[PDB]
Amino acid sequence: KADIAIAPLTITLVREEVIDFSKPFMSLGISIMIKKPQKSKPGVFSFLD
């Protein structure tokens, strides 16, 4: 149904067994997403901070 796929498709072993793949154009990994640490109300701990 298609000729070539240019899309972020994950290169796995089970996809290699049916179709072929080229060299990777962009490497990546699993990272940590947290919010940006803003100012928090310190309280009583600011007496001897």
Binding site: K41, G43, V44, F45
Partner: protein, 169 residues
Amino acid sequence: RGVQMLLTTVGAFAAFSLMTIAVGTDYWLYSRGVMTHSGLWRTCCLFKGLCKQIDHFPEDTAEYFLRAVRASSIFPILSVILLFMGGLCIAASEFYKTRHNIILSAGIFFVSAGLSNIIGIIVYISANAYSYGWSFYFGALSFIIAEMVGVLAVHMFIDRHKQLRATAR
């Protein structure tokens, strides 16, 4: 003699009335999404005219403790109860002064009630995190009248103690 006692009594009565007015409404002012007043129990906007209890306690453990103190007004309600108890003690000590030492405990309770009311004002100012209501200024003025009434009460107590010490010799 009786003039200072009557002035202390009407000062305690005016302080209790202004404390009741501070409990009632118009304690603070905060512009909502338009201005809106609050009296530590419910908020009322300046649609317009509706009122609801906006004292929701949820949206370290010290933040939960401060939110628990700011919820339901633990400090100023007990402060007003202690002020009413001090007024009842001053009324019981005004007529039929049998024991000449209950006025000292009544004045100590009155000063502790004033200190607790000031601490509760500090808690309500800390939990506010744009203008202010009139009942906050009324509660501050009642704290001033309560401090002056405590000074007048302990002055009359030390004068009565000096009179009793002069009459004992």
